[PDB]
């Protein structure tokens, strides 16, 4: 059976599309306000050199910090999010922040050359730029594989925004108090997504798409864990805090 989207489900989708359009600038016009990207010579991918310089960290830290602010704005507009306690809202945002950034970044990722292209060549980020920020291939390679996999699903914008919302409102995050309420909120979003796919998404791949999307959420958890491990290592580097931002320090600290 392929039941039609209820008026409420249609409303949820409209609200999320609006939230995304207000919090994701497809022109990347604010990027010139971040600390400038610096790309030193490191064809050898020397960990020692990368850690001593962290040339791309200030720029990427600003980009990530800016993104967290946009994610906070998006989350506040998710139907039901405001009904949670502030304590639970913060737990959900802090635990999902890196995952939603990875998801939303798919919009600027291009399979033409496997990079995140955000306008001019100065704002084109490749694997080599991430290593210059202190991270290693143990995170980057799986990250790129994840981006290509997500890209290949060719999600409608409606599906893309529902996925980010579902990612944020997850009941199995450590520290949440009212898991039941959170689960209820997520279920409403999941049912909307499942109904949308069967009703609005044409073949091939009509079905199975939901399963593939859910698997991506599992993939994000692993990437989250690896990023946390690497962030810890990065925090050991003297004077690193100055290259980050207060928001980044709190969310990942």
Binding residues vs ligand TX5 (CB under 6 A): 60-61, 63-64, 67, 101-102, 104-105, 107-108, 116, 118, 125, 130, 133, 135, 227, 231, 248
- Measured CA to CA, the distance from residue 5 to residue 132 in angstroms comes to 47
| 193/251 with CB nearer ligand TX5 | 251
Tell me the CA end-to-end span of the chain in Å, nearest whole number: 47
The distance of closest approach from Cβ of residue 24 to ligand TX5 in the complex, given in angstroms and rounded to an integer, is 7
Min dist CB 65 to ligand TX5, Å, is 8
Which is closer to ligand TX5, CB of 84 or CB of 140? Answer: 140
Q: Is 24 annotated as a binding residue?
A: yes
The last residues before gaps in the chain (C-N over 2.5 Å) are none
* 201 known member of a binding site: no
CA atoms within 13 A on the CB side of 26: 4
CB of 204 to ligand TX5, least distance (A): 28
Residues 176/182, Cβ–Cβ less than 8 Å: yes
Rank residues 16 and 64 by Cβ distance to ligand TX5 and give the closer one.
Answer: 64
Closer residue to ligand TX5 (CB): 70 or 193: 70
The values of phi and psi at residue 84, to 5°, are -75, 160
Q: Is 115 annotated as a binding residue?
A: no
**107 vs 219, beta carbon nearer ligand TX5:** 107
Q: Is 244 left (phi over 0), alpha (psi -120 to 50) or beta?
A: beta
**Is residue 227 a known part of a binding site?**
yes
104 is in an annotated binding site: yes
Using alpha carbons only, what angle is made at residue 167 by residues 163 and 168, rounded to the nearest 5 degrees? 120
* Among the listed residues 143, 126, 141, the one whose alpha carbon sits nearest the alpha carbon of residue 42: 126
* Greatest pairwise CA separation for the chain in angstroms: 60
Minimum Å gap between C-beta 134 and ligand TX5 is 7
Rounded Cα–Cα distance for residues 139 and 137 (Å): 5
135 known member of a binding site: yes
Query: Shortest gap between Cβ of 201 and ligand TX5 (angstroms)?
Result: 24
Annotated binding site for calcitriol: 24, 67, 104, 108, 135, 227
Annotated binding site: 24, 67, 104, 108, 135, 227
């Amino acid at each position: 059976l392929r039941p039609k989207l209820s008026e409420e489900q249609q409303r949820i989708i409209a609200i999320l599309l609006d939230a995304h359009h207000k919090t994701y600038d497809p022109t990347y016009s604010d990027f010139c306000q971040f600390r400038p990207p610096v790309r030193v010579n490191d064809g050898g991918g020397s960990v020692t050199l990368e850690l001593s310089q962290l040339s791309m960290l200030p720029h990427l830290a600003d980009l990530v910090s800016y993104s967290i602010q946009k994610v906070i704005g998006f989350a506040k507009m998710i139907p039901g999010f405001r009904d949670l306690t502030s304590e639970d809202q913060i737990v959900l945002l802090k635990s999902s922040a890196i995952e939603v950034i990875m998801l939303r970044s798919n919009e600027s990722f291009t399979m033409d050359d496997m990079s995140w292209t955000c306008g001019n060549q100065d704002y084109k980020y490749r694997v080599s730029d991430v290593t210059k920020a202190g991270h290693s291939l143990e995170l980057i390679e799986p990250l790129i594989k994840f981006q290509v996999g997500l890209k290949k699903l060719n999600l409608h914008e409606e599906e893309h925004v529902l996925l980010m919302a579902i990612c944020i409102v997850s009941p199995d995050r450590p520290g949440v108090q009212d898991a039941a309420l959170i689960e209820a909120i997520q279920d409403r979003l999941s049912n909307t997504l499942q109904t949308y796919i069967r009703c609005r998404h044409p073949p091939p791949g009509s079905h199975l798409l939901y399963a593939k999307m859910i698997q991506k959420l599992a993939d994000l958890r692993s990437l989250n864990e690896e990023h946390s491990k690497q962030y810890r290592c990065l925090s050991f580097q003297p004077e690193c805090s100055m290259k980050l931002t207060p928001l980044v320090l709190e969310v990942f600290g």
